[PDB]
Amino acid sequence: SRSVLVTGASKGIGRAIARQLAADGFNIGVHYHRDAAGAQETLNAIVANGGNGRLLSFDVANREQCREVLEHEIAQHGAWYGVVSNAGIARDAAFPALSNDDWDAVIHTNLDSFYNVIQPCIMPMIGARQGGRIITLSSVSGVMGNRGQVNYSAAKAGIIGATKALAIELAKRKITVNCIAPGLIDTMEESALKEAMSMIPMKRMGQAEEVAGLASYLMSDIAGYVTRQVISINGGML
Template sequence: MTHTVLVTGSSRGIGRAAALRLARDGFDIVLHCRREAGMAGEVRKDIEALGQQARVLQFDIANREQVAQVLTDDIEAHGTYYGVVCNAGVARDNAFPAMPGDDWDLVMRTNLDGFYNVLNPLIMPMVRRRKPGRIVTLSSVSGLIGNRGQVNYSAAKAGIIGATKALALELAKRRITVNCVAPGLIETDMVDDLPVEEARKMIPSQRLGKPEEVAAAISFLMSEDAGYITRQVLSVNGGIC
C-alpha cells in the first residue's frame, strides 16, 4: 500500500525539494500552492515521472474556512493522509519599531495560524485511520535563537515549536509522531534580499544549506525508521547555536 503525504507550500523551495524527495522514497504526494498553480503543476509532472501519483490543492493557509473545506473535500475523495509536512510560510522583515501591523499580522496568520488551519481538520481523520502517521512542521533557526529584523517571524516560528511539542504529546499513544525541522539559511528565494556574505561568516560550516538537505531531514522523520522519534526539533543549520 502506498502512503500519501501532504506537503504545503510545495511549488518551490524547501517544499518542492521535500515533495520530490518523498516521492523518490515511494510516497504519493498532495502538493499545495496559494497562487503558483503552474509551478505546482510542474512539480506534479516531476513526481509522476518518478512513478508516484500527485495532485495539486490550491488554498491560502491563512484562510481557515477555505483550508478546512479544501482538505475535507480532498480526504473524502481520496482518503486520509499518512503524513503532513507543514512547510508553507512567509517572512516580512523589518526593525521592530518600524514594523507595520499588517506585516506582523500576515506573518502570524500565515506561519502560526497556518499550523492550526492545516492540521486541525486532519488530526481526527488520521486518528481514526488507526495506523501510524507522521507530522513534520517547519520552524527556523530564528524560532530557536531569534534574529534581528525578524521579531514577527521569530515569534511565529517559536510558536510552531511549542505547538509541535504539545501536539506530539496528544498524539503519541495514537502512533502519530509530530516533529519539527528548523532550517538555518537555505538557498531559496527567501534569502535573496539578505546580506548573504555577511551571514555566511556567522555559519560554522561557512555556507548556506541546500533545500535538498532539509528535505533529507524531513524524509527521515517521515520514514518508518523514525517511529520512536517524536516531540523533537531537528536543526539543519550548519552549526549555528
C-alpha cells in the same frame, strides 16, 4: 499506499520535500497557494520519476478555505498519512518600524497555519489507525531569535511550541510530531545575509534537497520513536 500533504510544494523546500517523499514511495498532495505552474512542474517531475501525486490549493491563512478543501480531499481520497506544514513568509523590519500588516501577515500565515491546516487532518488520521507523521517547518531564527524579524522569530518559535504540545497528545496514537529548523537555505537584506554567514561554521548555505533528506528520515517507518523534537539543519549555527 500512504499519502502526504506538502504545503508550499510549488517551490523551494516544499518542492524538494515533495520530490523526495514521492521517491520514497509516498503519494503526494502537492499543495500551492497561487503558483499553479510551479505546482504542476513539481508534480510532473514526480510522475516522470515513477511516483504519484495530485494538486490542491488553499491560502493557509484562510481557515475556512483550508477546512473546506481538506475535508473534501479527505472524503474523496481518504485520510493523509503525513502532513508537512512547510508554507510560510517573512516581512522583515526593525521592531519599532514593523507595520500592522508585517506583524499580522507573519503570525496569521506562519503560526495560524498550524491550526488551519493540521486540525482538519487529525481525527481522520486517528480514525484510519495507520499511525502517522506530522512535520512542521520552523527556522533557526525561531530557536535563537534574529534581528529585524521579531515577527518571524515569534511565529517560528510558536510553531515549535505547537509541535511539541501536539507531539504529547498524539504519542499514544503512533503519530509522531516533529519540527525541522533550517538555517540559511538557498531558495532578504544583503546586510543581514552577511551577518548570518558570520555564524555558519560550514561557510555555505544549505540546499533544499538537504532539508528534504531530513524530512525523508522523519517520515520513514524507522523514525517512529522520534517525536517532540526540533531538529536543526543549519551548518553548525547552533
